[PDB]
Chains A and B, each alone.
Chain A
């Protein structure tokens, strides 16, 4: 009974770990999207620099 209880506890722990990894994946996706946004902003800033009338 003790051994069976230990395995029924390890299944809880593994399920919690799976849900946590899912959460972190979905947060990292959003973070990468924000980074893509900032990169597009940098590129548009460079394009603005290309024009010297607005650069002055």
Chain B
């Protein structure tokens, strides 16, 4: 399950990163 895990966790972390990026960049607008 080498390849399965590696290039499924790649897009897994894609989703995770976009998730946290938006959840960090919204309260920015709130206090702004």
Consensus secondary structure, chain A interface = helix
User: Is A30 positioned at the interface, with any CB of B under 8 Å from its CB?
Assistant: no
Task: Give the interface size bracket for B toward A.
Answer: under 10
**Chain A nearest CB, measured from B24 CB (Å):** 10
Interface residues, chain A, with chain B CB atoms under 8 Å away: 3-4, 7
B25 closest partner in A (C-beta): A3
**Chain B nearest CB, measured from A6 CB (Å):** 11
**Chain A nearest CB, measured from B30 CB (Å):** 11
Residues on the A chain within 8 Å of B31, using CB: 4, 7
**Chain A nearest CB, measured from B27 CB (Å):** 10
Residues on the B chain within 8 Å of A7, using CB: 31-32
